[PDB]
Amino acid sequence: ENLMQVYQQARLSNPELRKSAADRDAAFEKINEARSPLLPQLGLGADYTYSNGYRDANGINSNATSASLQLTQSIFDMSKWRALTLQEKAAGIQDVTYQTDQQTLILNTATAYFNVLNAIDVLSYTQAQKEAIYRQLDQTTQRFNVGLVAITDVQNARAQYDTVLANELTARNNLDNAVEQLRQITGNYYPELAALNVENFKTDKPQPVNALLKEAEKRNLSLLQARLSQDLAREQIRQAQDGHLPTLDLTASTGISDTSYSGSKTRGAAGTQYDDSNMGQNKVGLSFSLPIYQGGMVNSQVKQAQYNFVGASEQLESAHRSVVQTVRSSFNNINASISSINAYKQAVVSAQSSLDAMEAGFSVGTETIVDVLDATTTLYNAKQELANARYNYLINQLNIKSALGTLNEQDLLALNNALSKPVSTNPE
Amino acid sequence: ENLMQVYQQARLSNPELRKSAADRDAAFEKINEARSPLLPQLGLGADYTYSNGYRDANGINSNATSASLQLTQSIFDMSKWRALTLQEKAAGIQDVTYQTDQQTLILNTATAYFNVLNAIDVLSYTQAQKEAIYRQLDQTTQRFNVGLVAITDVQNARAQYDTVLANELTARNNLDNAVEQLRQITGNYYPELAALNVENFKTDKPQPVNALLKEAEKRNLSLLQARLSQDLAREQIRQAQDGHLPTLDLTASTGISDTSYSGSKTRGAAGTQYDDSNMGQNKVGLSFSLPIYQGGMVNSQVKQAQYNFVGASEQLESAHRSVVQTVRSSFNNINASISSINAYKQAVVSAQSSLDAMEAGFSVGTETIVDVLDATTTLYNAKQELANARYNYLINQLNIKSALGTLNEQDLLALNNALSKPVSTNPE
Amino acid sequence: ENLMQVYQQARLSNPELRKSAADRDAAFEKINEARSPLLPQLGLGADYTYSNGYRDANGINSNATSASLQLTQSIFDMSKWRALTLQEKAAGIQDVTYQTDQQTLILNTATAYFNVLNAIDVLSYTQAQKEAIYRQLDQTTQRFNVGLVAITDVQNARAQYDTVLANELTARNNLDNAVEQLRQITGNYYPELAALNVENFKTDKPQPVNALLKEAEKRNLSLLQARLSQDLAREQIRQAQDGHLPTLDLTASTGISDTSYSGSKTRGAAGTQYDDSNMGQNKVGLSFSLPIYQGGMVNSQVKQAQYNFVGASEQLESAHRSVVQTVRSSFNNINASISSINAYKQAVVSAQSSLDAMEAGFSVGTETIVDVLDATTTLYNAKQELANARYNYLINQLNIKSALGTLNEQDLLALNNALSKPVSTNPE
Ligand SMILES: [Cl-]
Ligand SMILES: [Cl-]
Ligand SMILES: [Cl-]
Ligand SMILES: [K+]
Ligand SMILES: [K+]
Ligand SMILES: [K+]
């Protein structure tokens, strides 16, 4: 029923935002998988093998069983550490995209809200105009029954009337699909919304453009994310560079074995020389490894990593050049709106003088025909474009907030001042 | 020529649909790849080694040659079975995505079709207007030769006539590019298309809105595909969970081996030691394996898989809301159209009588030709919107079928009767 | 400030292009990582193991220390070669995707450039239009002081004037956002630009449409890319087929080893059985592999690759149809442009004489000045659409180059003295 109240409902169940939130959680949970390789690895394995000999190891043949519990532990390997750091960085980036998606739902709800309000005014002015054209037809049909005017008077007032009847539908339809889209973003239908209140509505000037621009540098989420991705691409070079380095792994195992020799030739061998042996061993061990050369694979991986970093740099610049033109065009548009409003307010008062003076004044004499209707078509156009400009202003205010990256639900809360009058979202 | 006639040719050569179809066949063929590890694995290998020994094994040498045929076979492993299930799931999802894409071709052909028809109307109404303004230039320029009118009217009617010539170009060119759109989809040029039969109409009230909802709910291809994706995500949770489980493998092999010894100090005491052995071995063997701890890896993967499933659920809820917004808006539009047709059908009769009765308003001076000049650009606007709403009605009929998920060839066959009259696509 | 000059600054620092270049430099570098498995792999490793043997393993302990330098070298493996061929293929595709992006920058700068000029023209005429409406408000307010007109005439001269005041602001604001769009591509603000010259202006008819298709057939980068993609798709089939062939690997190594046996059951007195050795080995060795059957995995992989090739085939068709649609749409557009130009060049002379002959019938007094109001809006709207068409034509020249696949810096030079008249971009 009110922008804030609407957003409140929208926020707690918007699937676009909730998907985003689930992406952030998984990203952060993946940190445990990335740390995984640094922690111990425990596993139990067992084996049976029945072999059967032939040719100077012929009549000798055996089946053997074993089982063992293995531990492995990675004392130092730089790749495994970088792998973790990278996932922390990845989860960091996902967090920012999620913050950016919170600001979109704000920016989108308002859009859908103000589109429904706009779709009303459009219909409402058409409505009032349909009647305004009608009253001209009514009078002319009276002024016809008793002489006075031709039929070249009736058909002008009938055509333009039948034109607007069809214009009423395309208008009435827009409102039904403005409301339906609001339901898509919010999750629920609204039979009424708080409309703009001309009594308590002021259009304040924004901070200087160079101050807005300076603030955006600090707080813009698009720009922030680009910095982190460059930070991410940098880290990835180290990872490629880690391939040259030594690695040391601890491994330990407990176990038992049993080989038994039975068969023709091995039915006794010299003096029990058939190795019927039940082994069993606790053992601990270290394995060192160092690459010396791998066909230039590692170097290639570094050089590739360095070029990608150049891309991430050039992407920071793209994000920046984008930020620089979003704060600037957002600034202009407010400065366009205030001017549009101030002009269109006097374009109404001017068109009001043409109504008050040449409409209500046109009872006797002067001019008839087309000069009758336009003294109000101008009054409606100006009235439409004025309310239109007012909503533009409101959205330009929110668009400057998101450029700064500081848009939250308190900027929707400030707009409870501008809204008051509950208005039907139904073509009555 | 006819709409279905056009679609038929498009359907069997369209590269987008056939790219889709091929993607769906790969998806299905991959089930054979995913099944693979469950089947037996056969392979042959061989090795040679020359060992020149120093240190405490100094003055000894060996040649060692071997060859063996290896068979492996997975007895039980859950994750391998999941692999297969997940590809069956993958292929199923692809077939639904292929169906959606069959429906888009129907949708997109009809659109391009009615664009070409639309572009003809625009052009031929601009054409009819061009002559209409011309006849008024002609009459004023000839009533000037007598000297009955001022030069401020022969230049006036010439000014409106030169605007319509320009408008006749950007309308001729629109038709050329509307046809090029239509060729891109179908594959071939068309010199003639069946345009609407402006006599026998098909304005028919659509199903109750909640029945349409009910049917979209269980037949929409987008919503079905979203449902299967969630099913897929859940199936992946179990796959992550499969990490903790034990596995059993068969590995049986036939092979032979040889070792031969040389070098200075190569024997030892009695029996002539370090002798050559010529092994030949038939072995069958099992290998049980059970992880216990893997540094919290599996556990992390199962949390990610759960968080992903949250996203897939929200994705469904998101796809749901889309459908709701589609049927309800396809409903509003098809009702807007129904009513819009009736209004412009009447606004044509209205703007008609304005140039039937005023077709004597130049035959004296009821309303000076200037009035009739810009009265002709009223009967043409009404006639434009009427055809415009008529085609937009036909598209809105398919759009609802699409939203119900049942858009078929029958829908196109039903529109043969609404067509019939062949109309040029390159007029003179 | 001239287009060519503008493009220079843009080209050297545009981040989208420089990202694309870094993408190509990395892809080419990837070839070294692709070739690497074919070259030697060299590595050093060392191992220590302590063990104690429980029961029958006879309380017999050991220390085991070893180190070894190991070389491995692929002798034949077709998959490895095939990996390298695919990477060259991949890098080549990038090169074309970079050539396309060198053309996009030209196309975009020209487009962003002309919108700025266009935004000035819109503003230029709107302002001159405002002086034109004010001209007639100035005179009506004069004619009311002595009292020759109804106060009704004043309001039409004012309420129509305030309308123009309003859409001069949205015209002014349009220019600033046009200059800001332009900055984003170039990185520079431009206070002055070289506007089009009305004389010194081209109108050359394009080559025959069939000649344009024939040249696009063998030079258009989009299908050049699509061809290489398909070429790539095939190369992957042969890669899937490599899975059946034999492989051979050379593996040489140098190393030393040392085991020692402590424990009270070794050092007693018997019975001399367990002895420790310090071994040193020089080893050279070959290893042969032939898969006989891998559970239908390779065959599935080949049949997958075959279907993927059908996709690439069908996408070559998709790419092709677009080209056809593009050259034909761009040919149609240049021919629309010339006609449009000639129409409006005639429709200016037409709107001229309509406010030249009516200009004379003002200084001697004739007809309605309300007619002279609407007459001046249609006098300027020919000028606004003429200069517009003239720019549209110039972009259409470039769109036919992009389609041929030969758009480069020379086409920006050809346009140099075609635009010599400098104009400001922030008029006060
Ligand atoms: Cl290397
Ligand atoms: Cl684990
Ligand atoms: Cl196979
Ligand atoms: K045998
Ligand atoms: K480099
Ligand atoms: K040595």
Author numbering:
A (entry chain A), B (entry chain C), C (entry chain B): 23 to 450
From the paper:
TolC is a homotrimeric channel assembly with a transmembrane spanning portion and an extensive periplasmic domain that has two distinct sections: an outer membrane proximal subdomain in which 12 helices pack to form a hollow cylinder, and a distal subdomain where 12 helices form conventional coiled coils that curve to meet at a juncture that occludes the channel for all but the smallest ions. In this study, we have examined a network of hydrogen-bonding interactions at the aperture end of the TolC which, when mutated, partially opens the channel so that it becomes leaky to bulky molecules in vivo.
We have solved the crystal structure of the Y362F, R367E mutant in two crystalline forms at 3.2 and 3.3 Å resolution. Corroborating the in vivo effects, the crystal structures of the double mutant reveal significant repacking of the helices in the distal helical domain that partially opens the channel, relative to the closed structure. The crystal structures of the double mutant show that three of the six pairs of coiled coils move radially outward from the central molecular axis of the trimer in comparison with the closed-state form, widening up the periplasmic lumen of the channel like the iris mechanism of a camera. In one of the crystal forms (spacegroup C2), neighboring TolC trimers pack tightly so that the exposed loop regions of the coiled coils H3/H4 and H7/H8 pair in a self-complementary fashion, and the H3/H4 loops form a hydrogen-bonding network. In the C2 form, the maximal displacement of the H7 helix on the leading edge is over 11 Å in the case of the chain B, and the corresponding maximal displacement of the lagging H8 helix from its original position in the resting state is roughly 4.5 Å. We note that a similar interpenetration takes place in the C2 crystal form of the TolC mutant, where H3/H4 helices pack against each other in symmetry-related molecules. It is thus plausible that the shallow intermeshing of TolC trimers may mimic its interactions with AcrB in the acridine efflux drug assembly, where backbone-mediated interactions play a role in the engagement of AcrB and TolC static helices H3/H4. The asymmetry of the open-state structures is also reflected in the exposed surface of the three grooves that putatively engage AcrA.
